[PDB]
Design a protein around this nucleic acid. Structure first.
Ligand SMILES: [Cl-]
Ligand SMILES: [Cl-]
Ligand SMILES: [Cl-]
Ligand SMILES: [K+]
Ligand SMILES: [Mg+2]
Ligand SMILES: [Mg+2]
Ligand SMILES: [Mg+2]
Ligand SMILES: [Mg+2]
Ligand SMILES: [Mg+2]
Ligand SMILES: [Mg+2]
Ligand SMILES: [Mg+2]
Ligand SMILES: [Mg+2]
Ligand SMILES: [Mg+2]
Ligand SMILES: [Mg+2]
Ligand SMILES: [Mg+2]
Ligand SMILES: [Mg+2]
Ligand SMILES: [Mg+2]
Ligand SMILES: [Mg+2]
Ligand SMILES: [Mg+2]
Ligand SMILES: [Mg+2]
Ligand SMILES: [Mg+2]
Ligand SMILES: [Mg+2]
Ligand SMILES: [Mg+2]
Ligand SMILES: [Mg+2]
Ligand SMILES: [Mg+2]
Ligand SMILES: [Mg+2]
Ligand SMILES: [Mg+2]
Ligand SMILES: [Mg+2]
Ligand SMILES: [Mg+2]
Ligand SMILES: [Mg+2]
Ligand SMILES: [Mg+2]
Ligand SMILES: [Mg+2]
Ligand SMILES: [Mg+2]
Ligand SMILES: [Mg+2]
Ligand SMILES: [Mg+2]
Ligand SMILES: [Mg+2]
Ligand SMILES: [Mg+2]
Ligand SMILES: [Mg+2]
Ligand SMILES: [Mg+2]
Ligand SMILES: [Mg+2]
Ligand SMILES: [Mg+2]
Ligand SMILES: [Mg+2]
Ligand SMILES: [Mg+2]
Ligand SMILES: [Mg+2]
Ligand SMILES: [Mg+2]
Ligand SMILES: [Mg+2]
Ligand SMILES: [Mg+2]
Ligand SMILES: [Mg+2]
Ligand code: NA
Ligand code: NA
Ligand code: NA
Ligand code: NA
Ligand code: NA
Ligand code: NA
Ligand code: NA
Ligand code: NA
Ligand code: NA
Ligand code: NA
Ligand code: NA
Ligand code: NA
Ligand code: NA
Ligand code: NA
Ligand code: NA
Ligand code: NA
Ligand code: NA
Ligand code: NA
Ligand code: NA
Ligand code: NA
Ligand code: NA
Ligand code: NA
Lengths: 56, 237, 73
RNA sequence: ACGACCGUAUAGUACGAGAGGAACUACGGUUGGUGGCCACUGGUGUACCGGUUGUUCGAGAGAGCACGUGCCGGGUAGCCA
RNA sequence: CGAGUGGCUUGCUACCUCGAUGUCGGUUCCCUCCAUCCUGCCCGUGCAGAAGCGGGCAAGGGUGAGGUUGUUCGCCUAUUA
RNA sequence: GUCGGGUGAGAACCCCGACGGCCUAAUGGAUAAGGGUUCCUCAGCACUGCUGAUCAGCUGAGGGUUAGCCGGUCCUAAGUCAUACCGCAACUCGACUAUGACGAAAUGGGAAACGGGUUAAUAUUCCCGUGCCACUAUGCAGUGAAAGUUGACGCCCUGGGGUCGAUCACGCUGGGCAUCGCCCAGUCGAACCGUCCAACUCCGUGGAAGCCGUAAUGGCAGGAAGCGGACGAACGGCGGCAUAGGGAAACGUGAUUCAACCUGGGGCCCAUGAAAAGACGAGCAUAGUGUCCGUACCGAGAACCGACACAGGUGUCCAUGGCGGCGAAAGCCAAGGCCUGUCGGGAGCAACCAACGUUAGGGAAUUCGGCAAGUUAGUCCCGUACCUUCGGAAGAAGGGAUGCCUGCUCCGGAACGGAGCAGGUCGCAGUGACUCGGAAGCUCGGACUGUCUAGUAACAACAUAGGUGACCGCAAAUCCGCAAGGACUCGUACGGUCACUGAAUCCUGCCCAGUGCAGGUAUCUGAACACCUCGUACAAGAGGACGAAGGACCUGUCAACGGCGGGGGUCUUAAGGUAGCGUAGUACCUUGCCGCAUCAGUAGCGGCUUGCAUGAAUGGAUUAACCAGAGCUUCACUGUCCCAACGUUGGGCCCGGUGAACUGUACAUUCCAGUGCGGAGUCUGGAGACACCCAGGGGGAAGCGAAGACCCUAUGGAGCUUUACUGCAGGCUGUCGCUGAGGACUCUCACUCCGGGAGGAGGACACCGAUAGCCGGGCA
RNA sequence: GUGGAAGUCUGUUAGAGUUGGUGUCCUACAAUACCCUCUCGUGAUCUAUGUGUAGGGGUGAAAGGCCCAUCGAGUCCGGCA
């Protein structure tokens, strides 16, 4: 079976959904953790320095 | 390279864990204050999924219903007793001291009150030999002479299910079924049949171990494979 | 016996399966009564169709050379 | 756009102790190549005609489907070797 | 021993291409060369004849089928001018 | 698809009818996920739609989803999270242990709804009728009440009960056909309430010494059959429900086979087949309450994933529609759906191509190779070799039969079940289509079923049972974590870890010198702390004494890495190749020699065999069975070939419509020679050459495509190895701290483990922290 | 005779797999497709949903296979010009 087109048809599982906290569709409903804002994992908002050029 | 199979094991993932949620009971001797008046009637004989040996259900005088490490020759209706004054018959548990020498025992305790540690597999038995006021010498199924505190409890008779090892599995499927009831990854791929990256014996244009098989005790995990601290190898001499 | 194994497995394997299964299926003397109605219920489990005595024995024999030694002592 | 071979007459002759054994010429055919043609033989021929299995149209009659003819048998013209 | 011709083998060189000129063998289809295997015309003979051996002119045509082997090559079989 | 017709400015493809077709586990019906308004209505054609469009999943506007009894909700599953505790420099990190919560929408468990009607679109939700559950309140009953039962359970075989459906017989209603008398449709009616009970189990009676019983096993004086009784099933029968509903009408009755559903019997396990909530146990009337969330539509060759209206991918139920037949098979046909696997028109329609039919004589000559194709085929009877692990081989091989019609026989309760007989009879052909093995032999490999490189390798590779060695008594061996801690483990040597070999059968020789592991060790070597000497008013420092593991040294060990020669009638370096097998998947020479076989055989098989460079769990030999595995031979078969032909369907060609891409320094009608960085349409000399266009097969543009994978180079990269360099984890060992009382010893109070506790074991050790020496491609 | 075992056989039952054609396609219907052929199909079987394992780490009947068209060390961003 091809890893390409033929393996795309089984993709009907819901994972990332609209997040209660930040509003982004990144709330993984199976992990109950937001991949964008960190909701469900951290009280503090997910934010890293590498999200921008070092001197900025 | 990559961590060998033995290392993946320790992590305790699904693949390596035993199907605990499908196990019946943690077979251990009852706890008694003293007296010995504790006795019970065998209500049923069951199959222990963790040992491939039969285990007995017992209903005790004080109402407690529990599974017990069944020795051979124990049936429904039989009355078993556990305590210092327990009668000397098959299926009864009592401290090594009260047990007469030369009598086959099973489910022996290491430290008194641990509920049994030694001789609990299908058909095996320990051999009570020497007595004393300080030490009870028991000969374990491996042939080793173990010096135990005469206070250590033990059940009379050999463990049930003897001779299981006698019949061959014949086919892979039969192994598969048994293996599924233990904490073991099966089947087994030989190191020699793997890539160098995966195991110290991997690699080559033909299948053969790299270095010799007998590794040192001081060898680190990831490297300790083959014949561990072998005192000798082969069958000659 | 090992006739279900067809031409597979070899002599020893299916020869011993037959011998072990042959003796396993024999009429066995019930410890409770004394009747020849003891049959295997599973691995190490036996029972008499006469008196219903359900008991423990060997894996393929209701009595093993080791269990027989117990009585003596 | 023709190449080449075999056979017959020459001749059991010329030559030769013998054994053996030619030629010129004239003929007949074969093979390879070439161009064309279909009276004849052969192939095709889901034109056509017949036999027959299953199923559906109630039976009959007469039909449809079964891969582009269900299968089987025969086969005109044309095209072909 | 000496003098050459060819450019099919092999070796040598490193000129051409590493922002790629698709490999060997085979097959198919076309042209060519002659250092001619057959066929035509010749010369010699240790040329009686028949069958040959050697040479000359000559590239019009022909030079086919198979067994082992991927083989080229080669070995082998029966046909063949 | 075609002919009519409808609408419209416009119609091949929007609608009606007729005729003709396509789909039958799906192209039909219901749904999960997923989509998200795609659903319906009206109005439209700028966009989307492989052509067109009056149509539309498109554009715009409106409308549309109704629940005590369908789901969710509740329960618990693998498992997840939160809090607490502890770790960590620290956390949004981390294992354990407590507590709490979470975790099942088709498809786990579970209080309760059926029938009809209705809309453009919802419907067990609304409406009509009927019914049911839970809680609460009132009243009567009741004091019972929690023990127990249920929820609640594996795989294989099987009996009995039994509904729907299907079929048969006959009657009734309606339709069809028109030589017959046939053929089709219908003949209805739930939940629920009540009632019936077969199987199982048990009780009384009875009294079998051989009887009872089964599809089979089986049962019995420890009490069989028979007889009576208790308990006790269906989504089933029966009555109500129902002068409800539904039907134009009649509004049937019996039967067989029986999915569902119910209830039993047997067999298997080195495999043992969830839990919890809940329910029952535990009455009846009347009344009130039953909120919240989901509900449209698609569910796929256009509503999902794949950028697309993508030939891909995507779960569940309808597995009982008819004929057919062993069949959920083929083929044909219903119900239902569709003509949207969505561009058409024209040319006997050429070449060429894709699928395919048929080819005389020959019959593998084709080719690396029978690749491709073909042959065979269903069922019954007869018959069946070598070999074999006695199972198999085996459908071996080979031979015969096979339809229809008439009348019958046997098995069985019977089938619209099966097995036969006699007579008649048609064809070239009777498994007449369809469905449906070609066969045999030799050799190699792997024993077998199984696994694998998603996307060029399915194999001889991996796995396997079997064989073998190794480690460990559990406060273990092995492994994970920085730590707190953890897997193995609800486990205990018949265990489980770590490895090798790879079914069976016959076997498995010699070597411990090197290397590895392990044990021992007088003596030698062997770090740091402490100690002694020298040195310094101290210190750095130099030296000494003691000496752990480790090494030296000695021993054990090859089913441990591996080795098994040269020379002569020992030598290197321990031994010097044993059984076997052998020109091998290992043999350079090599197409080795002999033989088989063929006209001819670098092939194949057998024998020989000095083996370039076989050989015994780096397992050797061998082997029945098995195989999309490699090689060879035979029979059969055939367009693979001789050597090609004709035909069929879709393209190709012409017309309407739609409408890309690759590629492009320039110039460019070239050809033969030459030249040139030695492979020129473009330079030189000649030759040839009027322009444009159609079709073709691809000679050239060292054609297009890809900053060459080969090779080298770069004080490039990465993966891997090791007795490379350097280090880092880890293990072992000494010392210091924790740490206590009286080169060997006792104790108990820290500390550790066992025990529910009492208390027990151990004990200044171990753990932990620090340091030192050794080992250390496990890792950088 | 009964019984009905089996990693048992035949089998396009459902379902799973992928041997050959080196066919069709190869600016595809398709960034792994189509057709025929072929293999398994009561078991080490196949499958839906839920759930666990995470990057020098998983997972691996071992092919350096697989971990979202990405694997001899995933992907994103940052180090980074
Ligand atoms: Cl095991
Ligand atoms: Cl729902
Ligand atoms: Cl029964
Ligand atoms: K090059
Ligand atoms: Mg991938
Ligand atoms: Mg335990
Ligand atoms: Mg497991
Ligand atoms: Mg293995
Ligand atoms: Mg490998
Ligand atoms: Mg390594
Ligand atoms: Mg090997
Ligand atoms: Mg090996
Ligand atoms: Mg037709
Ligand atoms: Mg080229
Ligand atoms: Mg000449
Ligand atoms: Mg010429
Ligand atoms: Mg619509
Ligand atoms: Mg409209
Ligand atoms: Mg919940
Ligand atoms: Mg449910
Ligand atoms: Mg609707
Ligand atoms: Mg609906
Ligand atoms: Mg479409
Ligand atoms: Mg022919
Ligand atoms: Mg040939
Ligand atoms: Mg040939
Ligand atoms: Mg073939
Ligand atoms: Mg036929
Ligand atoms: Mg009869
Ligand atoms: Mg060979
Ligand atoms: Mg195999
Ligand atoms: Mg592949
Ligand atoms: Mg394969
Ligand atoms: Mg493949
Ligand atoms: Mg193997
Ligand atoms: Mg093994
Ligand atoms: Mg073993
Ligand atoms: Mg030979
Ligand atoms: Mg050996
Ligand atoms: Mg380059
Ligand atoms: Mg290279
Ligand atoms: Mg490097
Ligand atoms: Mg503890
Ligand atoms: Mg390295
Ligand atoms: Mg099978
Ligand atoms: Mg099959
Ligand atoms: Mg899963
Ligand atoms: Mg490799
Ligand atoms: Na190796
Ligand atoms: Na020359
Ligand atoms: Na040269
Ligand atoms: Na170039
Ligand atoms: Na070539
Ligand atoms: Na010539
Ligand atoms: Na040849
Ligand atoms: Na009823
Ligand atoms: Na049928
Ligand atoms: Na259309
Ligand atoms: Na199989
Ligand atoms: Na040695
Ligand atoms: Na040694
Ligand atoms: Na060897
Ligand atoms: Na296979
Ligand atoms: Na043909
Ligand atoms: Na060209
Ligand atoms: Na690399
Ligand atoms: Na029998
Ligand atoms: Na295929
Ligand atoms: Na990584
Ligand atoms: Na950067």
């Amino acid at each position: 079976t091809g890893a390409g087109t033929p393996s795309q048809g089984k993709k009907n599982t819901t994972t990332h959904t609209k997040c209660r906290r930040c509003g982004e569709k990144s709330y993984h409903t199976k992990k109950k953790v937001c991949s964008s804002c960190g909701f469900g994992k951290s009280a503090k908002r997910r934010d890293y320095e590498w999200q921008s050029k070092a001197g900025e | 390279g990559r961590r060998i199979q033995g290392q993946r094991r320790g992590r305790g993932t699904s693949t390596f864990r035993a199907p605990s949620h499908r196990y019946k009971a943690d077979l251990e001797h009852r706890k008694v204050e003293d007296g010995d008046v504790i006795a019970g009637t065998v209500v049923d004989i069951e199959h222990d999924p963790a040992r491939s040996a039969p285990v007995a259900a017992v209903e005790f005088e004080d109402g407690d219903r529990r599974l017990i490490l069944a020795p051979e020759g124990v049936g429904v209706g039989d009355e078993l007793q556990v305590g210092v004054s327990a009668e000397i018959a098959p299926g009864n548990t009592l401290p090594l001291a009260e047990i007469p020498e030369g009598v086959p025992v099973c489910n022996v305790e290491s430290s008194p009150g641990d509920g049994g540690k030694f001789a609990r597999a299908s058909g095996v038995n320990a051999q009570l030999l020497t007595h004393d006021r300080n030490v009870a010498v028991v000969k374990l199924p491996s042939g080793e002479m173990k010096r135990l505190d005469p206070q250590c409890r033990a059940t009379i008779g050999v463990v049930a299910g003897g001779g299981r090892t006698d019949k061959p599995f014949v086919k892979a499927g039969n192994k598969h079924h048994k293996m599924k009831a233990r904490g073991t990854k099966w089947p087994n791929v030989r190191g020699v049949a793997m890539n160098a990256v995966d195991h110290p014996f991997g690699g080559g244009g033909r299948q053969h171990p790299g270095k010799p098989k007998s590794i040192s005790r001081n060898a680190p995990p990831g490297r300790k494979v083959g014949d561990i601290a072998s005192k000798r190898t082969g069958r000659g001499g | 016996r090992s006739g279900r194994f067809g031409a597979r497995y070899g002599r020893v394997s299916r020869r011993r399966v037959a011998e072990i299964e042959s003796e396993m299926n024999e009429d066995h003397a019930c410890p409770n009564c004394g009747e020849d109605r003891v049959d295997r219920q599973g691995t190490g489990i036996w029972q008499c169709s006469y008196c219903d005595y359900k008991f423990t024995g060997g894996s393929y024999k209701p009595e093993t050379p080791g269990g027989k030694t117990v009585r003596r002592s």
